[PDB]
Structure 1
Amino acid sequence: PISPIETVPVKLKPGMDGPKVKQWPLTEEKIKALVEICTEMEKEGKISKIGPENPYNTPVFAIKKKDSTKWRKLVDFRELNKRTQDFWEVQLGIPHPAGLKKNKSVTVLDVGDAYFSVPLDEDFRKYTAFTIPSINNETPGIRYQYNVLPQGWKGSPAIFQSSMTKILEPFKKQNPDIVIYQYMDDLYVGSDLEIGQHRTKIEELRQHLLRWGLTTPDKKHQKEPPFLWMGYELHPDKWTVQPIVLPEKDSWTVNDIQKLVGKLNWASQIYPGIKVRQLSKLLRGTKALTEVIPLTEEAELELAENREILKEPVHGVYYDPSKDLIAEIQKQGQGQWTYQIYQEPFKNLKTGKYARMRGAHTNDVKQLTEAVQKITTESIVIWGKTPKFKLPIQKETWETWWTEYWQATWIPEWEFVNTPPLVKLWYQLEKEPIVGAETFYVDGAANRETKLGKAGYVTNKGRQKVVPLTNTTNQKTELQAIYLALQDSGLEVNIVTDSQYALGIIQAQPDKSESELVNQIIEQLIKKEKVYLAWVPAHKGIGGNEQVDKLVSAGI
């Protein structure tokens, strides 16, 4: 059953012609298995035999699935799709269940031969030419040509979709408010009507579509209530991913690990808490899916910490615009945060996680804010709205942050919340130099080639000190030098440096960085009373640097 719908105009890429592939014949029972279909497809009008004119060929395959009772054929337009223009991103984006409205009754219709009913541009047909020679290859004159949308062809999805949207147009007019979503070969119709009253409109729709050439194989409903779409399991008032099982080996590889992370992240949507900090930190090695990565102690305590949640099923609610939106964020540590969005208390709408990776040493606040972002963006993408934010942070601490920081930002409606992992700023460097504090002119370097450096300092009150180092960078030195300046200093101190690099990291006021040293320095910065810090040129710089660096250089 063809469709009387206006076919969209299709052409090839600028100065490009259609495929011509005289495929090698096969005098098998397969050759007859085709005619069984073609000479019943042309009958149904789907295809048509064309004259021995110019129409160029395309590969054909009469293969059938494993034990498939119905010996169905399939043609692959690998080269054609190369020549045909580009269309509109059929399914560019994806609808997230978390942003749907609870419907009382729903039913899914199978639009299999949907593509086989939608017509094709009368001027593009010729490109779909294909042929099939029999036994002694004495009769190659069995050439056909598509009239509807060919399965697996480039435009088939976009067009069909397009056509379909236009076919539902008038239906959702005579009876609007009826939710209808199409996806590939699926039609999710949902309405807030009683089973009977609901099933009424369905048959209407069916006949409606039937009058457009497109047929619905299943009589009424056939798809069982628990739906599986893109992994998502759908229910009238709840959603989740029923199947979410991750096996346990003893010596897996990158190939398996990526998938593990994949599944874990996938579950992040609902399963609150699911972390992957250490679980992924190891994939940093040169990608080789067949290379076995030894599990670490933390990787162990994590997977197990994860499985704990995954072992027990948890669901998600739907959207109700009438109620306001809200989301709460909580810190998990090591740069890992988790968020949950909901309308009704504990009536989880959806959850997720954000992580500042590949980079290092960053303020706790910067993240909280970065977190707010990911969400905001996500909120809008899904509900097209910004949620009220419930986050663990004092207004004051936050205020001083944006007032002190350089990069500009904006955190909308937000309110305070209490939780052990209370995010805050533990220290602040003195703006103006401290008057009654010792001064620690510091310096540090390393013979880049030899890898051996020297860190140390000198004070206003001639209190020098120097400590050799090996197997470290010029940077690790500059930092070490300060840790020192801190160690041997009092409660309130002023420190001078020659490294613009060292300067930054500190001002960032980060914390809990994987870098052992940085931690040893942070803890010092917290204990201290007052702490001023200044910066001056490394080489041609004086102020003392013209004698502090001449003291830390010995070897090359």
Structure 2
Amino acid sequence: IETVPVKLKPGMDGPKVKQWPLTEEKIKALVEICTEMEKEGKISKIGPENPYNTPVFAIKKKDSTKWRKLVDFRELNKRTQDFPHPAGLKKKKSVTVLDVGDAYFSVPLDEDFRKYTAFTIPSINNETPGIRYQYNVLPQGWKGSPAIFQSSMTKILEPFRKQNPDIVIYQYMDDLYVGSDLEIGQHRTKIEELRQHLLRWGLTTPGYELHPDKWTVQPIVLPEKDSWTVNDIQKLVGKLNWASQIYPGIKVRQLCKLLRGTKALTEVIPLTEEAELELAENREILKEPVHGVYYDPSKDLIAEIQKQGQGQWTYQIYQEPFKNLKTGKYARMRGAHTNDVKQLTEAVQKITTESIVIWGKTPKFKLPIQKETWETWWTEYWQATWIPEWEFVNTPPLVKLWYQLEKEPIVGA
């Protein structure tokens, strides 16, 4: 097959990322997968003359008891040359993600660019030199990949597209998001049909899937008591004062007046009529998301995560601080009780998914965890073809207390 010439952004050089140490277990899996791919002419061994390198690792998806190879092409992608997203699926009743990744292995990649796809399989205790490979066909996780397979993909989908316009198909890298408003039965089966359609063309394409709008940005609720103590008011005031950053209409003077005088924190204070109003008024302001916040396509999305303890986590997707596009409270996944990393990774994934569905873009994560810890175990629970950008931060206490007050349904479902 003829190949499209791919190049790096002007002035950029190939990625030279260092390989992370992998446990023996997954190292075996990589060798197994790599030798197989080598024979199939997917990848070729390279010498030391190639200085470029990208990290690799193996993961096991839920409901999958066989290893899969994932590469961290993030560095390469950011350096790759640039070459649509609907809205409907955001409003859809149910969405199903399909792994159309394999299809790329069919298309060959521009000879000269291949050098940049270099990767290494590490050796235990540095006993032997790592096996150095290089891609020949399109690599999974690479951005240029879907950007090249586009042609074949559109055609392959056209029939289903035209015979089922009531469904929305979106492709984000190795994933194919198919959403429909049809009830559970028809949808599941229709997906199965779409699958078989792909199967017929060659590539195997593997409750049910997602649900777009059952995700509502819940407001912040303020507590109510029959009587308040100095301490309570102090807490309330502390929160409000901060909240004014998002809602400038929030005032707290009247409450502050009741908080004047060196009295016991346990001491109860009757709310003055004027304070009652100020409080009530603030509740009103807080009843809905701030106006004016609009998604700017050219700017990157940011996602802050906060550990709430007890398995809960809070997050915010925004572009400019306080001007959040969405907010949410993630609950611990049934089982991941002993470790935060599990919950964190899971959270990271769920959020990105939503970022994709809604904006079709990967948000930068501000992870509340020490680099060392994250780098060492994230792979162990990662179950996504993509890897989002991230940075680590020292979570400010104030923001945590605020979102902690996110409204919760009297009964979820």
What's the TM-score once normalised by structure 1's chain length? 0.34
**Pair 204,22 (structure 1): closer, same or farther in 2 beyond 3 Å:** closer
Q: Deviations over 1:165-189 (max 9, x none)?
A: 4542343245545433344565443
Q: Deviations over 1:503-553 (max 9, x none)?
A: xxxxxxxxxxxxxxxxxxxxxxxxxxxxxxxxxxxxxxxxxxxxxxxxxxx
* 1:252 Cα offset (Å): 19
**Pair 324,70 (structure 1): closer, same or farther in 2 beyond 3 Å:** closer
Query: 1:14 & 1:196 partners in 2: Cα distance?
Result: 50
Query: 2:59 & 2:387 partners in 1: Cα distance?
Result: 58
Higher mean alpha-carbon deviation, 366-375 vs 143-152, is at: 366-375
Query: 1:37 & 1:346 partners in 2: Cα distance?
Result: 46
**Counterpart for residue 37 of structure 2:** 41
* 1:11 Cα offset (Å): 0.8
Contact 1:254–1:290 (CA under 8 A) maintained in structure 2: yes
Contact 2:308–2:404 (CA under 8 A) maintained in structure 1: no
SS in 2 for 1:374: helix
Query: 1:41 & 1:59 partners in 2: Cα distance?
Result: 17
* 1:210 Cα offset (Å): 2.0
* 1:298 Cα offset (Å): 11
Larger radius of gyration: 1
Q: Deviations over 1:174-232 (max 9, x none)?
A: 55454333445654435577876665543332122223444332xxxxxxxxxxxxxx9
Query: 1:184 & 1:277 partners in 2: Cα distance?
Result: 52
**Counterpart for residue 337 of structure 1:** 313
Query: 1:411 & 1:75 partners in 2: Cα distance?
Result: 9
Query: 1:338 & 1:27 partners in 2: Cα distance?
Result: 32
Trace 1:78-477 onto structure 2 (pairs within 5 A). 79-81=75-77, 83-87=79-83, 109-111=98-100, 120-132=109-121, 134=123, 139-140=128-129, 142-156=131-145, 158-159=147-148, 164-173=153-162, 176-183=165-172, 187-190=176-179, 201-217=190-206, 240-241=216-217
Higher mean alpha-carbon deviation, 262-271 vs 351-360, is at: 351-360
Query: 2:73 & 2:393 partners in 1: Cα distance?
Result: 58
Query: 2:373 & 2:253 partners in 1: Cα distance?
Result: 27
Contact 2:295–2:325 (CA under 8 A) maintained in structure 1: yes
Contact 2:27–2:122 (CA under 8 A) maintained in structure 1: yes
**Pair 199,321 (structure 1): closer, same or farther in 2 beyond 3 Å:** farther
Q: Deviations over 1:140-171 (max 9, x none)?
A: 37221234554554535655667644542343
Contact 2:230–2:264 (CA under 8 A) maintained in structure 1: yes
**Pair 417,132 (structure 1): closer, same or farther in 2 beyond 3 Å:** closer
Number of paired residues? Answer: 411
SS in 1 for 2:328: strand
**Pair 25,377 (structure 1): closer, same or farther in 2 beyond 3 Å:** closer
Where is the helix percentage greater, Structure 1 or Structure 2? Answer: 2
Q: Deviations over 1:305-359 (max 9, x none)?
A: 5767989999999999999999999999999999999999999999999999999
**Counterpart for residue 16 of structure 1:** 12
Query: 1:182 & 1:52 partners in 2: Cα distance?
Result: 36
SS in 2 for 1:331: strand
Higher mean alpha-carbon deviation, 281-290 vs 150-159, is at: 281-290
Higher mean alpha-carbon deviation, 157-166 vs 417-426, is at: 417-426
**Pair 282,44 (structure 1): closer, same or farther in 2 beyond 3 Å:** farther
Query: 2:174 & 2:180 partners in 1: Cα distance?
Result: 20
**Pair 116,334 (structure 1): closer, same or farther in 2 beyond 3 Å:** closer
**Pair 350,115 (structure 1): closer, same or farther in 2 beyond 3 Å:** same
* 1:128 Cα offset (Å): 0.8
**Pair 352,78 (structure 1): closer, same or farther in 2 beyond 3 Å:** closer
SS in 2 for 1:234: coil
**Pair 107,351 (structure 1): closer, same or farther in 2 beyond 3 Å:** closer
* 1:77 Cα offset (Å): 3.8
**Pair 333,167 (structure 1): closer, same or farther in 2 beyond 3 Å:** closer
Contact 2:43–2:137 (CA under 8 A) maintained in structure 1: yes
**Pair 139,242 (structure 1): closer, same or farther in 2 beyond 3 Å:** same
Q: Larger relative contact order (C-alpha < 8 A, sep ≥ 6)?
A: 2
Q: Deviations over 1:379-414 (max 9, x none)?
A: 999999999999999999999999999999999999
Higher mean alpha-carbon deviation, 118-127 vs 301-310, is at: 301-310
Contact 1:237–1:318 (CA under 8 A) maintained in structure 2: no
**Pair 138,366 (structure 1): closer, same or farther in 2 beyond 3 Å:** closer
Contact 1:99–1:318 (CA under 8 A) maintained in structure 2: no
Higher mean alpha-carbon deviation, 38-47 vs 385-394, is at: 385-394
**Pair 398,17 (structure 1): closer, same or farther in 2 beyond 3 Å:** closer
**Pair 204,126 (structure 1): closer, same or farther in 2 beyond 3 Å:** same
The alignment's C-alpha RMSD in Å is 20.9
Contact 1:13–1:83 (CA under 8 A) maintained in structure 2: yes
SS in 2 for 1:332: strand
Q: Deviations over 1:39-84 (max 9, x none)?
A: 3454676544346765743344569999998666644345534543
**Pair 252,344 (structure 1): closer, same or farther in 2 beyond 3 Å:** closer
SS in 1 for 2:330: strand
Query: 2:370 & 2:160 partners in 1: Cα distance?
Result: 53
